[PDB]
Amino acid sequence: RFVELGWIDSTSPVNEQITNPALVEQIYHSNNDQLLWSDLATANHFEAQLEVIHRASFSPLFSRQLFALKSYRQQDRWHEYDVLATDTLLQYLSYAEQAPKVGIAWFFEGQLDQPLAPPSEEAQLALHMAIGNQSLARLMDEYTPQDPAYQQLLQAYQSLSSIEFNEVALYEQMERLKRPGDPLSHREALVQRLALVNLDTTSILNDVAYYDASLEKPIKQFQKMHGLQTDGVIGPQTMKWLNTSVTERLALLALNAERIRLWPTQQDSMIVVNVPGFDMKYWDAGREVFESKVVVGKTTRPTPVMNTKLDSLIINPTWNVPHKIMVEDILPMVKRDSEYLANHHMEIIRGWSDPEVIDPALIDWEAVEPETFPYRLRQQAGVQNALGTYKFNTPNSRAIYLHDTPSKHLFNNASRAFSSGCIRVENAEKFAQTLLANQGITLDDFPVSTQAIALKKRIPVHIIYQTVWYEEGVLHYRDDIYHYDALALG
Numbered sequence: 001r002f003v004e005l006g007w008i009d010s011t012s013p014v015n016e017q018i019t020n021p022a023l024v025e026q027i028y029h030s031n032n033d034q035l036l037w038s039d040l041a042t043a044n045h046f047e048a049q050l051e052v053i054h055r056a057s058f059s060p061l062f063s064r065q066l067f068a069l070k071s072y073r074q075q076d077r078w079h080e081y082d083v084l085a086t087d088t089l090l091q092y093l094s095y096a097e098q099a100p101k102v103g104i105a106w107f108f109e110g111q112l113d114q115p116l117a118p119p120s121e122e123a124q125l126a127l128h129m130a131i132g133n134q135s136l137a138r139l140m141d142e143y144t145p146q147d148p149a150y151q152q153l154l155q156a157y158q159s160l161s162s163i164e165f166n167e168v169a170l171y172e173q174m175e176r177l178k179r180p181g182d183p184l185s186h187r188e189a190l191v192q193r194l195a196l197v198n199l200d201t202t203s204i205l206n207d208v209a210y211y212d213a214s215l216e217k218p219i220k221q222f223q224k225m226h227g228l229q230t231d232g233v234i235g236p237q238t239m240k241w242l243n244t245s246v247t248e249r250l251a252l253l254a255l256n257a258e259r260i261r262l263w264p265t266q267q268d269s270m271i272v273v274n275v276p277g278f279d280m281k282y283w284d285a286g287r288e289v290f291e292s293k294v295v296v297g298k299t300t301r302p303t304p305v306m307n308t309k310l311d312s313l314i315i316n317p318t319w320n321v322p323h324k325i326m327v328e329d330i331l332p333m334v335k336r337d338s339e340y341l342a343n344h345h346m347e348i349i350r351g352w353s354d355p356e357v358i359d360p361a362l363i364d365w366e367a368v369e370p371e372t373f374p375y376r377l378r379q380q381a382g383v384q385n386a387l388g389t390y391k392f393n394t395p396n397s398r399a400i401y402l403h404d405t406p407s408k409h410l411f412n413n414a415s416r417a418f419s420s421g422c423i424r425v426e427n428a429e430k431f432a433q434t435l436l437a438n439q440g441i442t443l444d445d446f447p448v449s450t451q452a453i454a455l456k457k458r459i460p461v462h463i464i465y466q467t468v469w470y471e472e473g474v475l476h477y478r479d480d481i482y483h484y485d486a487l488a489l490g
């Protein structure tokens, strides 16, 4: 009924499957009712690009279209294929344009289940042109992030895609742990599985019945690759990653490539925190000037994906204990431990406006119900302050900022989801120094007390969620700390 095309019949399912009949009609008329997709290499390139979106499991919309396309192809229904491909490429183009704007909706909040708006005029133009110059492939590639980050993940996806269904024995072992020097049953499976992730297995010795030196370094860099303690020990966490299928790895790659559409371009001066990587990097004038491990929010108080700017830096910050924390977390502990306040250098304050220190002794602690308790808590400046020596002020509606910690031992863990959402920074001192250097700010000597310092040039802070990324020659994988890789894996 609905698609007014001469060479498509009325009862074809394409009439219901198509999103923008109007715009498809126009394109086909402008090209004298000719097929855009009769070149195989071109259809295959576009089916490949939709497999990616399929595996990433974030768009039932594109999955529907791909199944339908793949179904028209198996039956040699090349007229129906042609028109549905054209409609689906319009969607791909809306998708390419909209993700950086509003893609947070599809990858974190909800999903791309409903047809997108048509693409911009600029895009419809580029398409018309591509149709005439027989360069649809170039058009699709042009509408992928021109980011080496993207292309490195796609390169790896393409390699692994080539060997998806090569069966490879599951790596097994007798005991839950297995240390250098122990007997080793399944050496073949283990080495095959180190190879899957393109670790160099060439120097590993053959048919040695034990976990020898030749295996230590490959195992330790497989561990590093997966952000695990490089202890050399084949335990459950190692085996989880060793024994992941190529299907599972391609899904991780797919999701993480598509996620790079969200991440806001790249700036010369910029700060990136990768949550599941529990790390962060400060670029300034094209240069990586600083990197550091961080602690991010716990699963229950997660660090959200967001973009803000670093406005100012506080040296020797006092910590104004927010209400929610005082009421639930702190007052009930001072109600029992009558030494809490003094140990944590935490003084009682009339109000944030009226900063009068009240001695804890002037208070009927039996009498206090935390919910209604009328004064406020303020931790004095110091090394043992919850914010340590440095607060990094990133003002935003969610009250998330970067700060030093006194609990520097927590950086020793592989998995660093301990905070109430804020981001604790190892080597805050160096971070402070490089910021001030690159702002053209000097300090005649280190301040006695609390010092606010506004940045001349505010830096964008991007907090991303990236479970796969390319860095110094190699592809890193990380556990799905906050469960957003959920659908990709099954």
Ligand SMILES: *C(=O)[C@@H]([C@@H]1N=C(C(=O)O)[C@@H](S[C@@H]2CN[C@@H](C(=O)N(C)C)C2)[C@@H]1C)[C@@H](C)O
Binding pocket: 322, 325, 329, 330, 386, 399, 400, 401, 418, 419, 420, 421, 422, 423, 424
């Ligand atoms: C940021 O997360 C909040 C602020 N920053 C820190 C932090 O990095 O965790 C917390 S302090 C810590 C978590 N809850 C407190 C607690 O459990 N007790 C028993 C005192 C200590 C702090 C809440 C916030 C400003 O957004």
